Amino acid sequence: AHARIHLRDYVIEDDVNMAIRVMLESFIDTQKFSVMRSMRKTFARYLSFRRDNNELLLFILKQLVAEQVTYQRNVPEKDLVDKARQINIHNLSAFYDSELFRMNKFSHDLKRKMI
């Protein structure tokens, strides 16, 4: 159903994580008050509320910048997205909206493709 909402012809882990979240949150909602918090931490710590993963793309960006600086000293967005497709972290738009690169003073532009 989530794939159909996104008009995907093929289902993906985005959709699977959405379905997982719906099931777990509703099951937690069925519980009593005291039991609900213990159930929340149980299923949250052990099972998949995959909110976001910005740290991997953050240090991939930092590694690529460090290597490029080392190469030049003695298209970075293309380099970043190439590594982001090589690793199973393909949802990079979340990283571009998140603060983790922004307070580290990186930026993006789909035209210039510099970061």
């Binding site: 710590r45 998949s48 993963n53 740290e55 991997l56 240090f59 199973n88």
Partner: protein
Amino acid sequence: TFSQDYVANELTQSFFTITQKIQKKVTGSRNSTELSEMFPVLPGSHLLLNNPALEFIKYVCKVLSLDTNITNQVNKLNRDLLRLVDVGEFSEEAQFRDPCRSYVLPEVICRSCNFCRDLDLCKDSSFSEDGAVLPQWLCSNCQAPYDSSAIEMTLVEVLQKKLMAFTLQDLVCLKCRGVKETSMPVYCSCAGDFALTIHTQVFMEQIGIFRNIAQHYGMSYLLETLEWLLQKNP
């Protein structure tokens, strides 16, 4: 309390960098016929270790997950670096298991001091003390050794009494979990099948423990008994 999070962030940087480094190095080692061949062997070894960066991550994250109750950043590090390795979470290779099949002979008596203490035969680093295994197997009241001859005979005796227990074990029905009352029936009073109370894989695992012990410490008589007991098998 709070400094756990600071060191977790420092590890979020350093652990990532280190795992990238060892990954690129070990997968670039051209001498590796199989990366499973890369790992060392000790008398407690049983796991089919395969891809050293993954084992590295697993062991580090185990100690991190147990040295603090704040497992959240450790689980985040797992989800980060396992995805860096491109190995899936919740797969069996991502789960930690103890690489050492620990086995203890309890209350070993020493004549140097009249003291008794518990001794693990698989734990020790046999490569660094292969000549000095018996000094390494010292009585903790002193530094006097326990001898290979007596320990080998003790292990054979343990095998015999254990195998006697296996032979004279009880049988339990799988549906109702009561014990088989008399010998001739093939099924229970209900339609359920009987099953072993002492499963054969327990004895295969303990025989493997004894075999690795005997191979690392050169116990040929124990190896004779073990080889016969292994040959008369399915």
